[PDB]
């Protein structure tokens, strides 16, 4: 979820 795979959509962690 962290940043997955680079916080494309700016993901949760």
Same mark, same amino acid.
């Given at each position: 979820? =962290? =940043?997955?795979?680079? =916080?494309?959509?700016?993901?949760? =962690?």
């Amino acid at each position: 979820e =962290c =940043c997955n795979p680079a =916080c494309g959509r700016h993901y949760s =962690c």
